[PDB]
RNA sequence: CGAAGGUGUGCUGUGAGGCAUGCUGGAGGUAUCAGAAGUGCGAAUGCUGACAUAAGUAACGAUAAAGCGGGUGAAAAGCCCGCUCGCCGGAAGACCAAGGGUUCCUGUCCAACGUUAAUCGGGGCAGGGUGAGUCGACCCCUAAGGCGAGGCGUAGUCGAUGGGAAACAGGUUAAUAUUCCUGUACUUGGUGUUACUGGUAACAUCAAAUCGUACCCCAAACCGACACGGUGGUCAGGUAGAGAAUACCAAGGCGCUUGAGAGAACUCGCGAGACUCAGUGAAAUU
RNA sequence: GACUUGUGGCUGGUCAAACCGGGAGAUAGCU
RNA sequence: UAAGGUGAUAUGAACCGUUAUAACCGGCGAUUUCCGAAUGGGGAAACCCAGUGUGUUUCGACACACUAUCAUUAACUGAAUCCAUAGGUUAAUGAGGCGAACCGGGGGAACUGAAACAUCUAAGUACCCCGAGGAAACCGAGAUUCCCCCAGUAGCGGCGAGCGAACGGGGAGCAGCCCAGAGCCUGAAUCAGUGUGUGUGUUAGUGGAAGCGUCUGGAAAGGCGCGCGAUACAGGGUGACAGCCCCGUACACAAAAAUGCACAUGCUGUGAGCUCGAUGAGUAGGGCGGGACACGUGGUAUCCUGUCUGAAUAUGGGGGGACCAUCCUCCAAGGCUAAAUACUCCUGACUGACCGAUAGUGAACCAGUACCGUGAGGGAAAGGCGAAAAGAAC
């Protein structure tokens, strides 16, 4: 049961998520590196006590900035578009 | 608190470890990301508590 | 990447005893880039 | 009640010098009797760092064409926006496979980065990461070519751009779609019911991973500083014609990286170059 | 049809024994 | 040790501690990714899939454990081929790692002056491979090696340049063992390994005496007058040059864990004294066929001896600074031997007629850097922050 509690990290809010929230009712949040489609779906049904429809998984490469005279690179984080039905709470 | 749970059995100490992760760990992270977590020291305190409980499980 | 790491990579030198001496100097002089990728 | 060094002057000594004071500066310094060296600098095209003359001059380049209007700003010759005809245009176009891994969208800012300016931007910062069981094929099996315990290539283990269940199209973006919403069609397991004799057919329900994905892709954003060139592969529309020439140089992407007067000889066909001029802005030699 | 693409094998008098490091802070008495 | 902290560059915002649950230092446990010698199969050091066997409030999800080899010991099983042997399974022990200097073993160069020349020196060198170690290997007398001497010697060479020994002595910072052992007698003497307790040390800490004031200057570590201290003035920092305003030194104390050098007791221990014996057989020499020892098979000593053969124990051999002779010792397959001396990549203390940002080390800070090249090799510049940031409200 503890596996489904460490799959999420922090909610992702942006200008694109606010548009699809009032149209298709789909929220997006940042998850960990793992967390397949069977672990993210089972976590929303208990933590958010709401029903979903489809959960997608995709990983993006970390951006590389030019901070000072030393090169730096961040990490890769996975996102997921939590698609809800007609009645949601948050 | 370090020796308070040192005399606890595995089942009950495993349970509080479960509760520490489910509540006050996941919820805190959401609040911090969303920006309504005024006080951040809770994240430090809960993380250390989880480690302290976890080491006792392995030690026991 | 394709025809660059198969002949000039890290595993290309550890497969024989002659290439082991090449990577030995990289350990004493640890640059920012060990091998190309 | 102002050290040494640096920076002036004066005095002293036939040798290289040493001593005093003033200005600047405000923290540790030196002589006599000795000794030990990386030991006093005008050149070896000496090496490093900081700087002249040449010269505010030459130069404005692998070649479609400038000018007029309006808006923003203290400042608009050149940037942004709008209208008409002709230079580009089966390719100086777009979509895949590499390299690169946030250079593509938005907002703010103009020091550096860019052959001038550059309020723009391909610059910096912030906001904003690109929806996938039916987008591409992974795993496994097979051919050529390899590997292959013994022996000195057999039995096996492996290796696809073909054969390998599916979806052809449209709408919706400020930036990226064939996916989510809506309408339709097809296939492969498990479970429950019915029919036929575990298998088949009809109806319903549940489950099905990871990686890649934008911009660039025929020369601008990538590799020789002036496309002083090299550069894989896919699609030959409508009319006319025997064909891929020619004819309507169609539609779309858009229309040299920068101005104003004058307009020899020579060259190319009143124009296009050269020379003299705002601004910006060099090397060799000595 | 002497088209094009990918992999592997055979052939070392300019990739046909290039550069750097060690020998070597070597070594030409003249310049 | 409790009157403070959440490393530094580098501040703010956010918390904890106050009549004993803060932080920092030391010791004893649990815990301690993918990937890199990486062993399940490939491979690109961070791309992709785990195979088999249990338990499980989850017959659809996870975590943990075991398996590329070779060699040794024990148990079990098994072909050609009746016995033996190869292969396969389980358990235990041992280890296929990388980076200096020095030493040893197996291989192996050029350039300088050479009268001339494949004579020679330089040079059993630089560098590189495998493995091991903590350092390596005619006056006398039989562990061994290194340093200090004999000694730029007595010799050797177209006696050209070079290369190159020993005994004695001056210096002892050496400590000389076990087996071939039957019999009367064993848990002996001398010692080692593995536990506990006491005493003495090493590796983290605390207590620890000693200058009060005035003039000048914004500020006093120096000056004048009067004292304390001194087993302690070794050095550096504390607004200008500091014993006594701080941080370090005499003296006096502590042991929950681990380790090293003498001593009580216990278990397993290759084992002495006295008496009765012995002092090391496939060897030397000779014959046939090769190579390495400077020497082409020489006038040729010594070292190594595959295959086919073969003696002796004062009736055989070597040595006494080597003709022949004499007396004593020695006369073939055993097993061991510390420290000092070699070597300086890491820690703490201490030292200097070395240096102070073109010096010293590529590199005094974000130097094994930015940048360049297919990879490897090779390879720059840059602090003079101020005592305290008082680093400009309007």
From Swiss-Prot, chain A:
It holds the Pfam family Ribosomal_L23. One of its GO terms (cellular component) is cytoplasm. The keyword Ribonucleoprotein applies. One of its GO terms (biological process) is ribosomal large subunit assembly. Keywords: Ribonucleoprotein, Ribosomal protein, RNA-binding, rRNA-binding. One of its GO terms (molecular function) is structural constituent of ribosome. The keyword Nucleus does not apply. PROSITE patterns: RIBOSOMAL_L23 (PS00050). Part of the 50S ribosomal subunit. Contacts protein L29 and trigger factor. Might also contact SecE and probably does contact SecG and SecY when the SecYEG translocation complex is docked with the ribosome. Belongs to the universal ribosomal protein uL23 family. HAMAP family: Ribosomal_uL23_B (MF_01369_B). One of the early assembly proteins, it binds 23S rRNA; is essential for growth. One of the proteins that surround the polypeptide exit tunnel on the outside of the subunit. Acts as the docking site for trigger factor for Ffh binding to the ribosome (SRP54) and to nascent polypeptide chains. This is Large ribosomal subunit protein uL23. The lineage of its organism: Bacteria, Pseudomonadati, Pseudomonadota, Gammaproteobacteria, Enterobacterales.
From Swiss-Prot, chain B:
GO terms for biological process: cytoplasmic translation; ribosomal large subunit assembly. The keyword Ribonucleoprotein applies. One of its GO terms (molecular function) is structural constituent of ribosome. Disruption phenotype: Cells missing both S17 and L29 grow very slowly and have a rather unstable temperature-sensitive phenotype. InterPro entries: Ribosomal_protein_uL29, Ribosomal_uL29, Ribosomal_uL29_CS, Ribosomal_uL29_sf. The keyword RNA-binding applies. Part of the 50s ribosomal subunit. Contacts protein L23, trigger factor and protein nascent chains. Might also contact SecE and probably does contact SecG when the SecYEG translocation complex is docked with the ribosome. Binds 23S rRNA. It is not essential for growth. Belongs to the universal ribosomal protein uL29 family. This is Large ribosomal subunit protein uL29. It comes from Escherichia coli (strain K12).
Swiss-Prot record, chain C:
Keywords: Ribonucleoprotein, Ribosomal protein. GO terms for biological process: cytoplasmic translation. One of its GO terms (cellular component) is cytoplasm. It comes from the Bacteria. GO terms for molecular function: structural constituent of ribosome. Belongs to the bacterial ribosomal protein bL34 family. Part of the 50S ribosomal subunit. This is Large ribosomal subunit protein bL34. It comes from Escherichia coli (strain K12). The lineage of its organism: Bacteria, Pseudomonadati, Pseudomonadota, Gammaproteobacteria, Enterobacterales.
């Amino acid at each position: 049961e503890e596996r489904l509690l460490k799959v999420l990290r922090a909610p992702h809010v942006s200008e694109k998520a606010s548009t699809a929230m009032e149209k298709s009712n789909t929220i997006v949040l940042k998850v960990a590196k793992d967390a397949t489609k069977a672990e993210i779906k089972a976590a929303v049904q208990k933590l958010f006590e709401v029903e979903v429809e489809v959960v997608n998984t995709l990983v993006v490469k970390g951006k590389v900035k030019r901070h000072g005279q030393r090169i730096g690179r961040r990490s890769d984080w996975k996102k997921a578009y939590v698609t809800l039905k007609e009645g949601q709470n948050l | 608190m370090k020796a308070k749970e040192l005399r606890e059995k595995s089942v009950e100490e495993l349970n509080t470890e479960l509760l520490n992760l489910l509540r006050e760990q996941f919820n805190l992270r959401m609040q911090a990301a969303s920006g309504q977590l005024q006080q951040s020291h809770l994240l430090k305190q809960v993380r250390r508590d989880v480690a302290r409980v976890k080491t006792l499980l392995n030690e026991k | 990447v394709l025809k660059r790491n198969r002949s000039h990579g890290f595993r290309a030198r550890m497969a024989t005893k002659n290439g082991r001496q090449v990577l030995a100097r990289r350990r004493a002089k640890g640059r920012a880039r060990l091998t190309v990728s």
